[PDB]
Symmetry: C3
Subunit: 529 residues, 3 copies
């Protein structure tokens, strides 16, 4: 027994048997997407469309409904009795230091978005207005954006994060996105076909998710070069893709990820601390209460905005906006949960939440307040930043209108890169981890096999943005349910938790004990007469 | 014969008969008292129905979150007689009914076509968010109070299953049997009379305007809107005089089918995707606009919405206060041994779920019809709009015949479940009501339905509403004061003292 | 017996100057008011806005959570206690802006909203007079009352900062500075409040057919009269003076409102209770989020003379109010004290505005306006005269107006003397009458500095006076936390599992 016991400890830990049926079926869709997008660029882009108008139009309500559920659900679980439960066992304290913890996850699950949409999204919602609302409305412009980037999207991570972190550290299963479904699917099913199907959908959803954030990032680095210092031909779209395609493959191997994302303060924060002072410092402050206040005010209105909203005239806006962000963050969750779990060893199910929602929310707030704020201010001063309307161009158009803009258009260029890099190395490691049966430390070649093959989709979704968008949206549609159902696994798992049962056992006990106590003191007081 | 309090049955009868006589005999000097009182009630007591309507929702929710939420309806540490899933399935049954049939298509659409006060017209959200506001939290918060009350007094303590006993903490022991004890249980009865009879009329009128639309009867003549009732009035008796057990589940299961069937029909045939969109739209909006709706009044809209109210909000509120005695019993019965916290959340969410999807489907499909050039409005006659909706969909010719029947079945399960509850408050809290009393009440109640329905004449629903409003008005304070009894009663509970 | 000179003298140099400067250099004086006003507003407005809400959430978090159970002790009847404090914290408020505010927000609308909009005219008026302000009273009083009754330090506002500044700190230059700002803030606030009051009472005589002239020889009478009248009460201390007045003050309060409630648009006023509350909850966050950047930039000026002024004003009032709230709240639990400064004062503000603002709107609606020439200090009486028997009740309103101020003045004065003697609870009458008159004569300064410069200086000078004190009120928000966590009843509970 002793010889077969410890032999399996070093067995699964060393296990590098790359699942041939988890990797290949993914390599298939990936390279098939590349070729069906290189060789076929006429019917492929039609797939993106017809599919989108099917996903968005027939499942949009599901993103809309459950998107707001995932928020509440996890807000409950957090303030729930399951809160005190420690991810792993009570023999484990926080793995990394808190500040390094919250910083490693917020800088890992954060698409280049804040760069890309930070300046645009608010300035757009302000110029063109959003459905069911007037125009040039600061409140709605801010509240809406906030709504896209704070609690709503980040509770998605929390769910998958807690679902894996528990299924792994607390129970002891392998770090598969499918093992988190054991409470429902069973020990057998997670090793059956579904287990893979999920670990597949997870990988494919991860790919399109990263490739999108890659394409957008590329377009903006390129547009960042076009306006700052120019490449009409796709030499740099494929060249700057390489610069990054190789950059994050570095950390996937190496800690390098523990340090790369760590420096996003000298870069990102600097940019913000810069724009804060230089620009409309006061106006920005005015948008802090204006963002939180208005965000809280209009919250449910947004969760209710569907296709019938605005007298049925919003189906489009959603697809271009909200519904895209939902599906897009979803495609990221499979691997952002994987990562979030790891650094959350020993984190209570509660503290894990607040560090996943509140911190990233507070930043997303103070970020869109600066750039999206300053932008809307210039738009007001008649000193527009809009330009041609190309989001990729706007970011810098704003920076440049500020004393010391060129120097920051370079910083924000690299920052745009690193923002992707630090959140693409974690992707790869996970791409392979699932490629090798929850192999915590995947062979550095298999992860690099994905990270690069994932950028082979970026060069496709960008050379053949409504493709980087649509394809991503479609690639996440099924995995949506992988989060919706996951929201059930996490419950029928906790509810089967030892320490919780030991609590719910000593709970029933007392109602009986107390009952006896009061019933025999109702006789003492009744027999008294 | 028996000892069933005459002092509660005679004062109840006289007022029902007086209304049937003063409704039939003086069918012109009755409509006056109707609009005359309705004007006093809505003007002078509108702020009340409004202010307290929302109060009840706070009160109830505070009582679940409160440390009282752990207490369970019955002896200490008692447990449910049914499984939490069978429990739910019974409230689901309580959800669907005539009100949903009648106002399921009309109400939303109306708030679209016309828009509500303080808001623009053709507003999909607001049209739903308002509907929700009428049929979800607010209405059930009321029932949940009365229910919670009757369930505590009966199971936790051991008082008779009566509303008077619910007031013991305040009125005193001698009070439940005294004048108030009878008064309260009288108002409760007449409340249930016009409360149900209201539901009955809608059916009889809808069924009627459904025959003239199904091309069976020439027009909903004042002779047509009679044959409808009387036969369903005979249908009632048969289910009561041979054991009322057929109404609670033998018809419930029939309704659970026809209804679920019908809803699914429009759901799949009609704009399935739109209907779905109106799930987060209904809920999402209904949360955004909750308090703005809780603060709407005659002053609202620059002082120009006190009428919109008396025809909707104030009416419904009065229709809920009135039905609260009946629903309180039903709930109280199928909820013994359930914790208060678990009780409320079930009585608020399960039903809310039913209404949400239901309106989301019907109204939803109506609103989408409006949006896309194809209106079902017709003559604005809410009675016929359900069918109009139906006939606009393929096979909507047979579904219009089915709805005709589910109305009958409902007309029973409503006049049937009510007859028992009505008979119960007549016999000192007797659980199993007499086979003659219930059967008698149901018919009496229906007699009022016919009365209000015929007394108004052309679009008589006014009376139905007005009178219902006038019947509930006193019992609105009953419920309000019922909040106070519940609190002291609970603060005196042995477990909150044990803790 | 040994009044802290370093907290008094340095606190007098500032008020003994705002006079000579406001009287000697009349021009450059207001050129500072109008200047500072803009600096504070344009640059700190965001704060009053932001943290203003922090005060509501934080205080509600505390009261309902753990610490709420803590007692404020190791004295006064309860129903007298509420009036004691309500009267002490509430001044000219309901009387000066009780008719004009809803009526103004209605006619003109409010930044980012249509006009003739009842719901918002209430939501906005209610926003200013219910929770947000009274949370500013709960905090200061709390930090003090606790630092004193639960810990043992003196009632000096400074000592409530002990948990952060140190037992040595509240004795250092800050603890004094804190009790220095505490004094001055308390003074301007009552001066501004006195200016408005007397000013309104003056106009109360104009259309009263008693004194047509807004003559100084008249307002001065009313001013000094108020002074001497409340000096009687301040010196008469709690039991005999203050406690007796605050009840009488409430008595008139009802009598008036009751009158206006029956005589005026009864049902409409009732209709407004739900409408006032509902809308208030709905538009709450939107209002907490309304900033100078709201309404596309246009919201700047409005906030300047409405919201921000209010917050800033209530802050110049937190020192004495909150500090007095504490003294009369020994034994009162943390939950009983926080729900004692909010619920009832917020629930009394509500009924008030629904009866007055409601009638004022209800009038606007029937064409029978009561706006006149748009002079706040007149509309109250315009409202009354329109109601049968309003002539006599008009006089009651004038008196009650004096009362409202009086009950707030005495508490101020006494509390001031407490800050003048290292926390002497019941200081020498002569000192509580010294500040009572000292602060009083300041009222004349801002009133006799110019016509519009009354409103100009009373408003602005007050704002500045409570500009730094704002941080003081946000600092207590920390010192109070630590002072709480490290409490016996709490230390004995943290031991779980
Ligand atoms: O539904 C109609 C009801 O009113 C009728 O009388 C009404 C009718 O308008 C009308 O029948 C009556 O005057 C009509 C004169 C010719 C009818 C014969 C009358 C002779 C005197 C007694 C009443 C009937 O005046 C009454 C005014 O209310 C009759 O009483 C009945 O038909 C019924 O009660
Ligand atoms: Cl705004
Ligand atoms: Cl119990
Ligand atoms: Cl809408
Ligand atoms: Cl309104
Ligand atoms: Na006062």
């Amino acid at each position: 027994a002793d010889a077969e016991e410890e032999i399996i400890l070093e067995g699964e830990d060393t296990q590098a048997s790359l699942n041939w049926s988890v990797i290949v079926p993914a390599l298939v869709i990936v390279l098939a997407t590349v070729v069906w997008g290189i060789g076929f660029k006429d019917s492929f882009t039609n797939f993106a469309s017809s599919a989108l108008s099917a996903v968005v139009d027939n499942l949009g309500w599901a993103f809309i409904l459950f998107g707001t559920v995932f928020v509440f659900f996890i807000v409950v679980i957090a303030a729930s009795k399951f809160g005190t439960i420690r991810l792993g066992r009570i023999d484990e304290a926080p793995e990394f230091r808190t500040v390094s913890w919250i910083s490693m996850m917020f800088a890992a699950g954060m698409g280049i978005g804040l760069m890309f949409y930070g300046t645009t999204e608010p300035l757009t919602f302000y110029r063109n207005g959003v459905p069911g609302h007037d125009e040039h409305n600061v409140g709605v412009a801010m509240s809406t954006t906030m709504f896209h980037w704070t609690l709503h999207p980040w509770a998605i991570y929390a769910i998958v994060g807690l679902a894996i972190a528990y299924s792994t550290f607390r129970v002891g299963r392998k770090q598969l996105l499918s093992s988190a479904f054991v409470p429902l699917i069973g020990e057998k099913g997670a090793e059956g076909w579904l287990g893979k199907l999920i670990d597949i959908l997870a990988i494919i959803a991860t790919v399109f998710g990263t490739a999108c954030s890659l394409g957008l990032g590329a377009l903006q680095i390129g547009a960042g070069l076009s306006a700052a210092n120019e490449d009409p031909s796709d030499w740099t779209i494929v060249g700057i893709v390489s610069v990054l395609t190789l950059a994050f493959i570095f950390s996937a191997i190496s800690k390098g990820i523990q340090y790369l994302s760590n420096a996003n303060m000298v870069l990102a924060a600097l940019l913000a601390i810069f724009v804060f002072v230089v620009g409309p410092t006061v106006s920005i402050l005015n948008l802090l209460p204006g963002s939180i206040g208005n965000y809280l005010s209009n919250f449910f209105q947004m969760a209710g905005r569907t296709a019938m909203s605005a007298d049925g005239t919003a189906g489009e806006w959603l697809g271009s906006w909200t519904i895209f962000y939902w599906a897009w963050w979803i495609s990221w969750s499979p691997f952002v949960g994987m990562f979030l779990a790891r650094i959350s060893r020993g984190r209570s199910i509660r503290e894990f939440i607040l560090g996943v929602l509140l911190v990233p929310a507070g930043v997303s707030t103070v970020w869109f307040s600066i750039f999206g704020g300053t932008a809307i201010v210039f738009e007001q001063n008649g000193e527009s930043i809009w330009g041609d309307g190309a989001a990729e161009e706007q970011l810098f158009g704003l920076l440049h209108a500020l004393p010391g803009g060129q120097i920051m258009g370079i910083i924000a260029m690299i920052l745009l890169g690193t923002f992707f890099i630090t959140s693409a190395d974690s992707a790869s490691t996970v791409m392979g981890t699932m490629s090798q049966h929850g192999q915590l430390e995947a062979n550095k070649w298999v992860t690099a096999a994905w990270g690069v093959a994932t950028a082979a989709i970026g060069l496709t979704l960008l050379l053949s943005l409504s493709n980087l968008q649509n394809v991503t949206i479609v690639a996440a549609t099924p995995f949506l349910f992988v989060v919706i159902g996951l929201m059930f696994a996490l419950v029928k798992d906790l509810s089967n938790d030892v320490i919780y049962l030991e609590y719910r056992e000593q709970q029933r006990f007392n109602a009986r004990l107390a009952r006896e106590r009061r019933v025999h003191n109702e006789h003492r007081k009744r027999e008294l007469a």
